[PDB]
Amino acid sequence: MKTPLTEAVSTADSQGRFLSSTELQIAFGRLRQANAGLQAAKALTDNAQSLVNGAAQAVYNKFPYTTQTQGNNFAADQRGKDKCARDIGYYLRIVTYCLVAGGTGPLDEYLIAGIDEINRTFDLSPSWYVEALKYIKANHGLSGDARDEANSYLDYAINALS
Amino acid sequence: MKTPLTEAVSTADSQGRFLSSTELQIAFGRLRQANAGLQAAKALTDNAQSLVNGAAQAVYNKFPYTTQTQGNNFAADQRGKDKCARDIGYYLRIVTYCLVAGGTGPLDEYLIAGIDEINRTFDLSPSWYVEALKYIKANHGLSGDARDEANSYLDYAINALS
Amino acid sequence: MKTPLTEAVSTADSQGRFLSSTELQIAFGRLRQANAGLQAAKALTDNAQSLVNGAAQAVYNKFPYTTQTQGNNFAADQRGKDKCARDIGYYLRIVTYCLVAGGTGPLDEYLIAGIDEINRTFDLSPSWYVEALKYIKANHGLSGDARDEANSYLDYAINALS
Amino acid sequence: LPLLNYAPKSQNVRVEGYEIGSEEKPVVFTTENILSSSDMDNLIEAAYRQIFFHAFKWDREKVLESQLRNGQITVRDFVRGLLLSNTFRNSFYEKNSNYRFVEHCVQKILGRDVYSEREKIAWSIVVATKGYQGLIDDLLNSDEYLNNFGYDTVPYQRRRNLPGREAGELPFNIKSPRYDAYHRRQLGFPQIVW
Amino acid sequence: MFDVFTRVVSQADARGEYLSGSQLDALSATVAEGNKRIDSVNRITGNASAIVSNAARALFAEQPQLIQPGGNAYTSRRMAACLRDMEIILRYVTYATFTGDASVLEDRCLNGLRETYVALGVPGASVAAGVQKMKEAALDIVNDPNGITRGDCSAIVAEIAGYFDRAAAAVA
Amino acid sequence: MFDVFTRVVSQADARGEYLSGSQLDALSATVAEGNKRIDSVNRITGNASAIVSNAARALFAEQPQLIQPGGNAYTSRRMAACLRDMEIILRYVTYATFTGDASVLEDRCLNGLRETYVALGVPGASVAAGVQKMKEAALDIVNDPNGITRGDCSAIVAEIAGYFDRAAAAVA
Amino acid sequence: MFDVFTRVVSQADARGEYLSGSQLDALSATVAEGNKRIDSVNRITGNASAIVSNAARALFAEQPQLIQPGGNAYTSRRMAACLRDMEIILRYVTYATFTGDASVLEDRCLNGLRETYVALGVPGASVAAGVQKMKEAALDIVNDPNGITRGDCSAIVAEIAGYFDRAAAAVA
Amino acid sequence: AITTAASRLGVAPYNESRPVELRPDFSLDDAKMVIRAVYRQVLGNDYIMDSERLKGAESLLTNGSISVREFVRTVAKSELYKKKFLYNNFQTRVIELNYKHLLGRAPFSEDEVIFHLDLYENQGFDADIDSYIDSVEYQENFGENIVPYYRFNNQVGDRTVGFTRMFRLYRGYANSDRSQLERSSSRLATELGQNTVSAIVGPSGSNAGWAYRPSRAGNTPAKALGGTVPFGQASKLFRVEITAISAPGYPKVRRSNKAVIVPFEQLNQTLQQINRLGGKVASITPASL
Ligand SMILES: *[C@@H](C)[C@H]1/C(=C/c2[nH]c(/C=C3N=C(/C=C4\NC(=O)C(CC)=C4C)C(C)=C\3CCC(=O)O)c(CCC(=O)O)c2C)NC(=O)[C@@H]1C
Ligand SMILES: *[C@@H](C)[C@H]1/C(=C/c2[nH]c(/C=C3N=C(/C=C4\NC(=O)C(CC)=C4C)C(C)=C\3CCC(=O)O)c(CCC(=O)O)c2C)NC(=O)[C@@H]1C
Ligand SMILES: *[C@H](C)[C@H]1/C(=C/c2[nH]c(/C=C3N=C(/C=C4\NC(=O)C(CC)=C4C)C(C)=C\3CCC(=O)O)c(CCC(=O)O)c2C)NC(=O)[C@@H]1C
Ligand SMILES: *[C@H](C)[C@H]1/C(=C/c2[nH]c(/C=C3N=C(/C=C4\NC(=O)C(CC)=C4C)C(C)=C\3CCC(=O)O)c(CCC(=O)O)c2C)NC(=O)[C@@H]1C
Ligand SMILES: *[C@H](C)[C@H]1/C(=C/c2[nH]c(/C=C3N=C(/C=C4\NC(=O)C(CC)=C4C)C(C)=C\3CCC(=O)O)c(CCC(=O)O)c2C)NC(=O)[C@@H]1C
Ligand SMILES: *[C@H](C)[C@H]1/C(=C/c2[nH]c(/C=C3N=C(/C=C4\NC(=O)C(CC)=C4C)C(C)=C\3CCC(=O)O)c(CCC(=O)O)c2C)NC(=O)[C@@H]1C
Ligand SMILES: *[C@H](C)[C@H]1/C(=C/c2[nH]c(/C=C3N=C(/C=C4\NC(=O)C(CC)=C4C)C(C)=C\3CCC(=O)O)c(CCC(=O)O)c2C)NC(=O)[C@@H]1C
Ligand SMILES: *[C@H](C)[C@H]1/C(=C/c2[nH]c(/C=C3N=C(/C=C4\NC(=O)C(CC)=C4C)C(C)=C\3CCC(=O)O)c(CCC(=O)O)c2C)NC(=O)[C@@H]1C
Ligand SMILES: *[C@H](C)[C@H]1/C(=C/c2[nH]c(/C=C3N=C(/C=C4\NC(=O)C(CC)=C4C)C(C)=C\3CCC(=O)O)c(CCC(=O)O)c2C)NC(=O)[C@@H]1C
Ligand SMILES: *[C@H](C)[C@H]1/C(=C/c2[nH]c(/C=C3N=C(/C=C4\NC(=O)C(CC)=C4C)C(C)=C\3CCC(=O)O)c(CCC(=O)O)c2C)NC(=O)[C@@H]1C
Ligand SMILES: *[C@H](C)[C@H]1/C(=C/c2[nH]c(/C=C3N=C(/C=C4\NC(=O)C(CC)=C4C)C(C)=C\3CCC(=O)O)c(CCC(=O)O)c2C)NC(=O)[C@@H]1C
Ligand SMILES: *[C@H](C)[C@H]1/C(=C/c2[nH]c(/C=C3N=C(/C=C4\NC(=O)C(CC)=C4C)C(C)=C\3CCC(=O)O)c(CCC(=O)O)c2C)NC(=O)[C@@H]1C
């Protein structure tokens, strides 16, 4: 759970040192960002269902073969559609966690770590999740610091997937 | 050389990853502190000589024997008084550097590392320098974020000497 | 622990070989020195109280401020004088231990290791203990190999302090 | 004589962790980064922390630090110099049995816990047969050390914390203090209070 | 480790649900008191040497058997180790104060420390007594109102006191 | 490593004098540029995979000999090593941008890289060509006017371009 | 630099020994093979421009990325340096064939050639492919049945093939 | 001379190459041979295209209107020489190239750098070229009628520091002085400034570790200051230069070139470790005693 606060503590502990003004300034930046991060999380939470549903249709529209061909890794049936909605919901919920935390730590340990072999083992195309994340960027309706921080997390996920 | 920007990059480089929102908030905290640090350094620089002369006198008052005992390690002559004033000036100048750099990096780089060996082989009492830093804390005449950041550096030096 | 017998066995053990003629010569040197060291320890023990009282008083004479200014690290009160006489006694007692053992090992394991940390933490000037050890140098009344070995231990302590 | 064969045990380090850099990833102190003098101090203190837990200035080796600063020796050579130092022999070798010296050597050189009692038993004979430096060099030239830390990186406790868990395994400086109950009763401790 | 925000994040992820409005408001209140937390951390850090030293001197005055010959604090090396241990415990409670969660203090300092002190013969109750003296000195330092903006720091002080007694209980 | 502030600090201590008002004023101007610097770091970071992949695609389009069999970018591991290097160079360029000083880029990235590439047979001129393609792509990302507050980032853009030039000159 | 005779001489002088009867008989066998060695040298020399030009044409046909703009054999200066390289390698193979020893090749032609190719960005694998093209052409010319006295030149052909292999391996 | 290591280095082709002298009343083959030798040596084994050949200088040399020395001067003052060696190079590298081309040796000390850089800056490139050619060293070595050649062997006014630096400037027979690993960088700037030497690494043909070059910083120093103490018990210390380190891969491998000081007792283990990492040993030098 990489955040400004845990890294400041980790940096000080790796040197066996107390918390100097450097760590305090790290915390001040975290405090400056935190209110925007929390408000971004609330806005994404209240609009989570529509964002997830819209993201599934954007992935379905861009990749129609996912709703047509049979296979465990595709969404031709209701089972695959539910799995896809659940995955996009996982991505959206963990982004809100990152907005709350102030770092990529929630994405890092809940989703990003090991996602490569997750996609490879179950034959899930990462471009699907990239387009879902792109839709979330285009439709989350955020502005200012909240938008910048949320888009940073979303592009972190997109970069890890591509 | 500890400083939030260099520390954030070193943590990211150790992790081998691009700078995330965590490091961006580290920079934001540095930006929030940097101006007040700079006027703290400017105010310390303008009042440098009086603080240094005052700190020398405060040390001589608290430890009277330093001005009437013969020996290379005391200030009973002009040579000793000049070297004492020079040492306090070094402390003051490096504290201004820390205020400029936003961390204890200048203190660690230039003064803290190896000061115990110096005070021992030349039988200089670290309590003299602690009192000089104490006078500087009491008389630098700063307020707010400047006072707080400056006193952190002076207390870091005091803690290293005690 | 640094002593001729212990170091001889340690270095033979560290490369897994039997005791050759080199360790036998080390033991022969230890036997030559042992009677002088035992006699020196007895002589230092017999007037240990006079030696400790004179050394502590000598520190008070060279550093009268230690008996005047109020402080936990000073001997202004009886408490502080008791701590000081107790400290000189530790130095002298461990010096007798070194004479018995034949090496600076008792000083290293009981006094020297982490003495630096103590003087700084409790504001005890190592120059105080240096003058006490110089009194023990000048007033032990030893001669020959007993004086030479005892002075080597006392100068070892002085060099470590200064 | 060849080392006794001992079976491995399931460990975090023996298995792929899919690690993403975070606060629980140990800091890579490497001279490959051209370190300034203060960053070099941090690297040096990390090695002291890895090897001696804490290093009083009596325990410091200023000559070894100067050689490491100048590039005379590598980080692994500096680690070797710490293990061959008087501090390590007195604190960790002298006050412990050979078996509890192999642990305190596996833990802080390889950065992993000992597999079993058999591994401690197998490696404990190396000190008495090949010498003290023989044990230090066998562990430092091992594939485990070189593949994990190489020459330029200070060793560390590997894979201590799994992601998502509040607490990982005990740090080796907590799990294994310099001496055990054996030297404890030789010293006459524990003391009764009041 | 966990901080004040990530602790709630980890609980929410285990339940697999978004942060509720009440939890977000609680975190907002945490942010609102963040300045107090930072300056309390700063106040302890700038007085760390005095807190450690005064507490150690008080402990050896109340427990003279620690420093008499044969005591666990007797000889310079053991004494410096005791001082070092005080400073380490103090440093980690400041870490815990900074994060707002006790995971770093437990995971990196406290967990297994009782067994360490049992293995070395270090009297853990006396370490606990020293930590209580550290708590007293540190709370006095956090609470004086000289040279600081006036306010109510009772919540952060209670949190700091909780970290300190957490340390005292772990070593005991 | 050095950043913009510590570089000025280091020069002053070597000279042994307090920072002048002009140097303090220059650092204040850099502070006023801080938000733009953070945005530039974030924009290059947010498009890092796209920057590297598109630059690599353009490089192998203009220089097909790299990816033909026998070429240095041929075979999957060498191809993977190439892409990773581009990302590393880009990553250290963002580090230099973040600190405001090229010391991290020179000391940790460009030190020995020329020598490394000739020892492995990696064509440094083509690496330099790849660094250029990342350079134009990244400066276009930094100068994108959509969805950001209005201002003049020409100093940051010139500084980032200078870092890329150092990276490209070093590898060649 | 050695030949077939002086190579045996140098080895014997380091050992400090007279050439043995077996070594003298082996050298006598080389002398009896001398006419075929001279014919092979003359045949490769007589078709040298054709060998070089056809091999270069074949190489650029199956590696068109070499000659397209930006390729290493693009522009007349580079194409011509490429042609000169091919002719030089062929010439030194004739030298090695003439002397019966490879020393003239690695002492002169392959001495520092790889450093040249790495430093210039010349694709060593493509140079090796071109050397193989000259190899196959030259071996067919040496084994040409017409216009020569009949006999077995298999040993000479294998030696020439080895010299060509040395050259190709020195650049690949 | 150099006998055993001649082929290893690039010295062997120059051992049986006699100096090219233009005798009085020379033939046409003699004039052409001098032209070929001057082009090869003054222009540092660069391929010379027909459009780049100095037709007039060749004609004058053929006619006897100019001597070998004057022809060398004309080639060294030509725009051809300046595009190859002057316009794209740091002037210390230009001085290195001038010493290698016009004198056939490496610079000995920083004083030569001082003289030539001052002369270039105060009087121009042509005046600088003249000082190389009108030097006492040129006259005693080559004179008027001999093409300059590489002076590998020991001579009367030599320093062994020049012998070591020769192989920093010369990289083999099939090498072209503009086709070397350091490219346009000065090879001797650090070395002349510090009056130090580097271990000689031979050319790419006969030396597997030919590509080793030290980095800008973080280089292991030549001698083992401290003796055997950091290595426990050790007899002698050796500096091993290793190149082409790749096997572990990044981030385990940062710099592909590394110098290590290792004890004698670990030399075997060091060789195996180099083999696993795929590296090539460039040089091994005694670092202690
Ligand atoms: C209880 C702990 C005590 C207390 C604290 C308190 N502090 C503030 C406000 C601020 N403190 C800071 C701190 C710093 N400024 C810096 O630049 C640095 C150096 C790195 C530090 C540590 C800041 C920025 C503020 C806000 C600005 C201000 O000066 O007011 C408050 C006020 C409320 C708030 O949280 O902002 C309080 C209550 N006050 C007491 O009475 C206790 C003794
Ligand atoms: C494989 C190389 C081919 C081959 C060769 C071959 N040659 C000979 C014999 C001779 N060839 C010569 C050569 C020359 N005489 C000249 O004047 C010139 C120009 C200077 C040359 C190149 C000579 C003198 C001989 C001997 C007399 C003769 O003409 O026969 C042989 C026969 C055996 C021998 O070694 O003498 C052979 C086999 N023949 C083939 O079939 C290959 C295609
Ligand atoms: C939706 C974009 C596309 C799609 C989805 C789909 N996903 C799966 C299966 C899995 N999805 C995951 C992903 C996660 N699990 C997690 O815990 C997290 C991190 C918090 C993530 C991102 C996993 C692990 C699986 C496999 C195990 C499981 O079933 O949960 C499937 C089914 C695959 C199968 O073999 O059953 C599908 C269909 N399908 C589409 O067509 C969309 C374009
Ligand atoms: C320059 C390349 C481009 C540009 C930059 C620019 N940015 C600002 C202002 C701000 N940018 C930020 C940045 C962030 N806020 C966040 O929360 C995050 C994630 C952690 C980031 C990266 C902030 C805080 C500001 C200040 C407030 C604001 O929103 O404006 C400016 C304005 C001046 C300033 O320095 O503040 C400028 C000029 N604008 C362009 O047109 C360029 C393409
Ligand atoms: C003044 C508070 C007391 C005092 C001073 C005194 N100092 C020295 C000698 C030295 N002081 C230093 C300290 C520094 N040098 C540095 O470079 C820095 C870091 C940037 C520091 C802090 C050193 C190294 C020395 C010794 C060498 C030197 O002279 O510079 C002396 C003289 C000691 C001697 O001559 O042996 C004195 C007298 N004396 C008092 O009585 C004051 C109470
Ligand atoms: C006497 C020369 C001067 C002096 C003495 C003084 N010492 C202390 C306190 C301590 N002294 C020690 C030293 C040792 N303890 C050991 O076990 C050994 C090795 C065997 C040594 C050398 C220690 C550890 C302490 C602190 C613990 C304690 O409480 O005793 C004091 C009191 C300091 C305080 O703050 O309480 C004093 C007064 N004082 C003078 O003025 C003399 C010049
Ligand atoms: C002082 C209040 C009491 C005291 C302390 C004491 N401790 C030791 C020795 C050790 N303490 C530790 C501690 C830690 N290990 C860790 O990893 C952490 C930080 C994360 C802690 C807190 C360790 C490992 C040791 C042993 C190793 C070493 O000391 O270097 C001693 C010394 C005992 C010895 O001989 O080693 C002492 C004296 N003792 C008292 O009497 C006080 C009540
Ligand atoms: C057209 C006027 C007549 C013609 C053309 C022809 N040319 C070639 C082959 C080559 N042409 C070049 C020329 C250049 N390459 C360059 O890089 C540049 C400078 C930028 C030039 C001017 C070269 C080098 C070749 C050889 C390599 C290649 O084939 O690309 C051919 C093929 C000849 C062959 O042997 O394959 C032909 C047919 N021929 C005619 O009859 C036209 C009237
Ligand atoms: C052609 C098949 C390939 C090719 C070749 C190419 N080579 C160069 C440049 C040089 N080649 C040499 C080689 C030699 N010179 C000698 O004197 C000797 C014998 C002892 C050899 C083997 C040298 C030294 C050079 C550099 C000199 C020069 O003037 O360039 C080039 C030119 C590179 C450039 O101009 O930048 C080229 C093009 N290139 C290919 O693409 C083919 C695979
Ligand atoms: C004789 C005691 C040992 C020995 C010597 C030996 N040396 C060489 C070759 C050279 N010696 C030098 C040395 C110098 N050149 C200088 O200019 C200076 C003075 C300023 C010195 C000291 C050089 C550079 C060479 C090589 C160049 C040349 O010889 O002209 C050799 C020859 C090696 C070879 O032929 O390859 C020898 C034999 N050899 C022994 O076995 C003795 C222990
Ligand atoms: C002046 C602002 C600072 C300064 C200068 C200084 N430089 C040297 C020495 C040299 N400078 C060069 C420079 C160049 N070589 C080139 O090729 C180019 C042009 C293409 C340049 C600019 C060189 C090679 C040298 C060495 C030769 C020489 O010494 O002249 C010195 C002398 C160094 C010495 O110790 O001898 C000096 C003084 N020094 C300062 O303090 C100023 C800040
Ligand atoms: C891609 C644009 C080009 C390319 C690249 C390429 N690189 C390698 C191998 C390595 N690259 C490095 C580089 C670095 N080490 C560092 O410390 C840093 C700075 C922090 C960097 C960027 C290293 C160490 C290696 C060797 C080990 C490894 O591969 O990880 C290769 C592989 C070469 C080989 O022989 O395997 C390649 C292909 N190749 C091209 O042709 C492009 C122009």
GROMACS .gro file of C-alpha atoms in nm, chain C residues 39-157:
model
  119
  363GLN     CA    1   5.143  -0.745   4.097
  364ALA     CA    2   5.029  -0.427   3.924
  365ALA     CA    3   4.665  -0.518   3.979
  366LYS     CA    4   4.729  -0.585   4.348
  367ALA     CA    5   4.915  -0.256   4.390
  368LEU     CA    6   4.638  -0.065   4.214
  369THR     CA    7   4.381  -0.250   4.427
  370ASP     CA    8   4.551  -0.183   4.760
  371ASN     CA    9   4.522   0.196   4.735
  372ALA     CA   10   4.233   0.199   4.492
  373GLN     CA   11   4.033   0.432   4.717
  374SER     CA   12   4.319   0.682   4.742
  375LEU     CA   13   4.374   0.657   4.367
  376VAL     CA   14   4.003   0.710   4.294
  377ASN     CA   15   3.969   0.997   4.541
  378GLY     CA   16   4.278   1.172   4.410
  379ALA     CA   17   4.177   1.124   4.046
  380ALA     CA   18   3.821   1.249   4.103
  381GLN     CA   19   3.952   1.546   4.300
  382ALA     CA   20   4.204   1.614   4.022
  383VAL     CA   21   3.915   1.633   3.776
  384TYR     CA   22   3.742   1.879   4.010
  385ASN     CA   23   4.060   2.088   4.021
  386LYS     CA   24   4.110   2.100   3.644
  387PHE     CA   25   3.733   2.140   3.593
  388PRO     CA   26   3.599   2.345   3.887
  389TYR     CA   27   3.282   2.423   3.687
  390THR     CA   28   3.182   2.056   3.721
  391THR     CA   29   3.146   2.117   4.097
  392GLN     CA   30   2.976   2.458   4.065
  393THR     CA   31   2.716   2.472   3.789
  394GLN     CA   32   2.396   2.283   3.856
  395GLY     CA   33   2.312   1.991   3.634
  396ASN     CA   34   2.254   1.618   3.609
  397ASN     CA   35   2.586   1.575   3.430
  398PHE     CA   36   2.774   1.780   3.690
  399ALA     CA   37   2.907   1.704   4.037
  400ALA     CA   38   2.766   2.014   4.207
  401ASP     CA   39   2.563   1.801   4.448
  402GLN     CA   40   2.667   1.491   4.638
  403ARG     CA   41   2.464   1.277   4.392
  404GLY     CA   42   2.688   1.396   4.108
  405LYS     CA   43   3.008   1.350   4.310
  406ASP     CA   44   2.897   0.996   4.394
  407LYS     CA   45   2.831   0.927   4.027
  408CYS     CA   46   3.175   1.069   3.941
  409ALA     CA   47   3.366   0.870   4.204
  410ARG     CA   48   3.172   0.564   4.093
  411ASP     CA   49   3.273   0.633   3.731
  412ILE     CA   50   3.644   0.670   3.815
  413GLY     CA   51   3.623   0.351   4.017
  414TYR     CA   52   3.480   0.172   3.716
  415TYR     CA   53   3.768   0.298   3.502
  416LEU     CA   54   4.029   0.195   3.761
  417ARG     CA   55   3.864  -0.141   3.836
  418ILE     CA   56   3.849  -0.235   3.469
  419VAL     CA   57   4.213  -0.128   3.430
  420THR     CA   58   4.303  -0.379   3.703
  421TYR     CA   59   4.096  -0.636   3.511
  422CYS     CA   60   4.304  -0.565   3.199
  423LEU     CA   61   4.625  -0.609   3.398
  424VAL     CA   62   4.502  -0.945   3.526
  425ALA     CA   63   4.384  -1.060   3.183
  426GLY     CA   64   4.689  -0.935   2.997
  427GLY     CA   65   4.504  -0.736   2.732
  428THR     CA   66   4.270  -0.444   2.674
  429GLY     CA   67   3.980  -0.687   2.642
  430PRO     CA   68   3.812  -0.604   2.975
  431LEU     CA   69   3.821  -0.236   2.877
  432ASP     CA   70   3.678  -0.320   2.533
  433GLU     CA   71   3.392  -0.537   2.657
  434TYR     CA   72   3.301  -0.352   2.977
  435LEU     CA   73   3.391   0.009   2.911
  436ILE     CA   74   3.511   0.106   2.563
  437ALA     CA   75   3.231  -0.054   2.357
  438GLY     CA   76   2.957   0.206   2.351
  439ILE     CA   77   3.134   0.458   2.578
  440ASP     CA   78   3.100   0.719   2.305
  441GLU     CA   79   2.720   0.687   2.304
  442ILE     CA   80   2.720   0.739   2.681
  443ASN     CA   81   2.934   1.051   2.708
  444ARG     CA   82   2.718   1.226   2.447
  445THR     CA   83   2.385   1.102   2.588
  446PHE     CA   84   2.464   1.207   2.946
  447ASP     CA   85   2.679   1.515   2.864
  448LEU     CA   86   2.989   1.366   3.023
  449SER     CA   87   3.295   1.527   2.876
  450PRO     CA   88   3.557   1.264   2.790
  451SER     CA   89   3.818   1.524   2.891
  452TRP     CA   90   3.703   1.477   3.252
  453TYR     CA   91   3.787   1.106   3.246
  454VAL     CA   92   4.111   1.179   3.060
  455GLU     CA   93   4.237   1.390   3.353
  456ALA     CA   94   4.132   1.121   3.600
  457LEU     CA   95   4.331   0.860   3.406
  458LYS     CA   96   4.628   1.096   3.392
  459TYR     CA   97   4.619   1.116   3.771
  460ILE     CA   98   4.623   0.735   3.783
  461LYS     CA   99   4.921   0.749   3.544
  462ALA     CA  100   5.114   0.989   3.765
  463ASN     CA  101   5.026   0.844   4.105
  464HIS     CA  102   5.015   0.466   4.080
  465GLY     CA  103   5.377   0.438   4.192
  466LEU     CA  104   5.453   0.134   3.977
  467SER     CA  105   5.783   0.049   3.813
  468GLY     CA  106   5.924  -0.177   3.547
  469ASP     CA  107   5.688  -0.402   3.355
  470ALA     CA  108   5.404  -0.326   3.597
  471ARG     CA  109   5.418   0.047   3.525
  472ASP     CA  110   5.458  -0.015   3.151
  473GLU     CA  111   5.161  -0.249   3.118
  474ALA     CA  112   4.934  -0.039   3.345
  475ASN     CA  113   5.027   0.281   3.161
  476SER     CA  114   4.951   0.110   2.830
  477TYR     CA  115   4.598   0.031   2.948
  478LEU     CA  116   4.549   0.381   3.087
  479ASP     CA  117   4.678   0.542   2.767
  480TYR     CA  118   4.453   0.309   2.569
  481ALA     CA  119   4.155   0.445   2.764
   0.00000   0.00000   0.00000
